[PDB]
Design a protein around this motif. Structure first.
Motif, short mmCIF file in Angstrom:
data_model
loop_
_atom_site.label_atom_id
_atom_site.label_comp_id
_atom_site.label_asym_id
_atom_site.label_seq_id
_atom_site.Cartn_x
_atom_site.Cartn_y
_atom_site.Cartn_z
N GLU A 170 -10.10 -12.09 -12.02
CA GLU A 170 -9.44 -10.84 -11.55
C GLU A 170 -8.06 -11.10 -11.01
OE1 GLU A 170 -11.98 -8.89 -8.66
OE2 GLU A 170 -13.38 -8.41 -10.27
N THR A 171 -7.29 -10.04 -10.81
CA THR A 171 -5.93 -10.22 -10.32
C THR A 171 -5.79 -9.88 -8.86
OG1 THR A 171 -5.48 -8.00 -11.06
CG2 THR A 171 -4.79 -9.83 -12.47
N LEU A 172 -4.89 -10.59 -8.22
CA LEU A 172 -4.50 -10.28 -6.88
C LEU A 172 -3.84 -8.89 -6.82
CD1 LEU A 172 -5.35 -13.16 -6.56
CD2 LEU A 172 -3.06 -13.82 -6.03
N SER B 74 -1.33 -6.23 -6.08
CA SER B 74 0.09 -6.54 -6.07
C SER B 74 0.83 -5.93 -4.88
CB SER B 74 0.75 -6.13 -7.38
OG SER B 74 -0.19 -6.20 -8.43
N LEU C 259 0.92 -8.85 -2.66
CA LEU C 259 1.88 -9.89 -3.04
C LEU C 259 3.29 -9.51 -2.72
CD1 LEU C 259 0.44 -10.94 -6.54
CD2 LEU C 259 0.33 -12.26 -4.39
N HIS D 105 -7.54 -12.92 -0.97
CA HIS D 105 -8.69 -12.91 -1.83
C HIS D 105 -9.69 -11.93 -1.27
CE1 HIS D 105 -7.90 -17.22 -3.54
NE2 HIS D 105 -7.23 -16.30 -4.21
N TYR E 229 -2.17 -24.01 -6.12
CA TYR E 229 -2.49 -22.67 -5.84
C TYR E 229 -3.25 -22.62 -4.52
CZ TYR E 229 -4.69 -18.10 -6.18
OH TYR E 229 -5.15 -16.83 -5.92
N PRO E 230 -3.03 -21.57 -3.74
CA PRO E 230 -1.99 -20.56 -4.04
C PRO E 230 -0.66 -20.84 -3.34
CG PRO E 230 -3.21 -19.82 -2.21
CD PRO E 230 -3.80 -21.18 -2.56
N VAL F 216 -11.65 -11.12 -4.34
CA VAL F 216 -11.14 -11.36 -5.63
C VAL F 216 -12.03 -12.34 -6.36
CG1 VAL F 216 -9.33 -12.31 -7.00
CG2 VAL F 216 -8.82 -10.92 -4.99
N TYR G 260 -4.81 -19.02 -11.32
CA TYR G 260 -4.08 -18.91 -12.61
C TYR G 260 -4.98 -18.86 -13.85
CZ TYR G 260 -0.34 -20.71 -9.50
OH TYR G 260 0.53 -20.96 -8.45
N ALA H 120 1.43 -22.70 -4.05
CA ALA H 120 2.43 -22.97 -5.06
C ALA H 120 3.07 -21.75 -5.68
CB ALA H 120 1.81 -23.81 -6.15
N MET H 121 2.57 -20.56 -5.39
CA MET H 121 3.23 -19.36 -5.86
C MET H 121 4.55 -19.07 -5.15
SD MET H 121 0.50 -16.37 -6.47
CE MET H 121 -0.55 -16.78 -5.07
N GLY I 232 -0.63 -8.83 -13.42
CA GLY I 232 -1.28 -9.33 -12.17
C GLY I 232 -1.51 -10.82 -12.28
N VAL I 233 -1.34 -11.50 -11.15
CA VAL I 233 -1.57 -12.93 -11.06
C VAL I 233 -3.06 -13.24 -11.12
CG1 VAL I 233 -1.12 -14.98 -9.70
CG2 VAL I 233 0.39 -13.00 -9.49
N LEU I 234 -3.46 -14.20 -11.95
CA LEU I 234 -4.86 -14.61 -11.99
C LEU I 234 -5.22 -15.56 -10.85
CD1 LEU I 234 -6.68 -14.86 -15.31
CD2 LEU I 234 -5.90 -12.97 -13.89
#
Ligand SMILES: *C(=O)C[C@@H](C)C(=O)O
Ligand SMILES: [Zn+2]
Lengths: 8, 262
Positions: free
Chosen positions: B187-189, B191, B194, B120, B217-218, B183, A6, B220-221, A1-3
């Protein structure tokens, strides 16, 4: 999972 | 140049719009970050973490109660609207518009946007710590115990609310403790989300970055993925770019954007 911002 | 942008605009069939904190800022929504973004002692980095919640859930929920409440007086700015109405206008023409936002204030929804992805999460959703159920919630106050709590002045007394009175999951089978479906740091997004966004961005033929830059971010993802397909990208934010130079419309989204989307 993406932080959120980051993990910086 | 605007003219040029508008020419792409008219052609576009699948617009994707990524939105950062700049656009919530212009409606007066605090983010509690950088200088003087404080709530009592803390900044958001301090409180928006699983650890804070595990440690002092009353305090965190106080923080979030506040945030939920100050929303009652912040309204969508013109940028929110210009987007929503765009989506509406173009949808009628069979052209799609999607919103990918890092903001959690639900302002785009209140502006009338429909195809939105909140990556988020949202202050007006809960997640049960026990069963994991995600539910909408705009009640004010979210629970009695929290009535008129969450004052922002540093010297406020902690409400130090017992856990069993903080918001609880309404399926009594369970009755787990609710947390804000947002979020947190570390923690993680989700998925599933995504993947959907990847799909949308892959499909898109014009991409807008509003209230943030592609460089961070974000945005830049992704912007790299879309750009490498040759799709044009327009930033709208209060930032500046160097004398020697994607399009960039410096200035408040509130002003820059609506003319751009008419
Ligand atoms: C991320 O910036 C959103 C989250 C950390 C919050 O509590 O606002
Ligand atoms: Zn539950």
């Amino acid at each position: 999972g993406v932080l959120k911002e980051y993990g910086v | 140049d605007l003219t040029a942008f508008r020419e792409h605009f008219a052609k576009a069939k699948h617009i994707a719009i990524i939105t950062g904190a700049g656009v919530s800022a212009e409606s007066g929504v605090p983010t509690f970050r950088g200088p003087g973004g404080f709530w009592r002692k803390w900044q958001a980095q301090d409180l928006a973490t699983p650890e804070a919640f595990s440690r002092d859930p009353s305090l965190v929920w106080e923080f979030y109660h506040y945030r939920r409440e100050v929303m009652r007086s912040k309204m969508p700015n013109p940028a929110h609207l210009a987007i929503a109405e765009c989506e509406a206008r173009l949808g009628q023409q069979g052209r799609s518009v999607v919103i990918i936002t890092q903001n959690i204030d639900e302002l785009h929804h209140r502006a009338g946007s429909k195809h939105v992805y909140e990556i988020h999460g949202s202050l007006f959703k809960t997640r049960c710590m026990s069963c994991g159920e995600v539910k909408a919630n705009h009640k004010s106050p979210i629970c009695p115990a929290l009535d008129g709590k969450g004052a922002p002045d540093p010297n406020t007394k902690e409400a130090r609310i017992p856990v069993e009175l903080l918001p609880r999951c309404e399926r009594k089978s369970c009755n787990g403790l609710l947390r804000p479906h947002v979020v947190w740091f570390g923690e993680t997004l989700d998925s599933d989300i995504l993947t959907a966004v990847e799909r949308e961005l892959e499909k898109c033929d014009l991409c807008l970055v509003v209230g943030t830059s592609s460089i961070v971010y974000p945005a830049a993802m992704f912007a790299p993925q879309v750009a490498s397909r040759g799709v044009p990208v327009a930033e709208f934010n209060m930032e500046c770019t160097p004398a020697t130079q994607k399009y960039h419309f410096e200035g408040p989204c509130g002003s820059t954007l609506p003319p751009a989307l008419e």
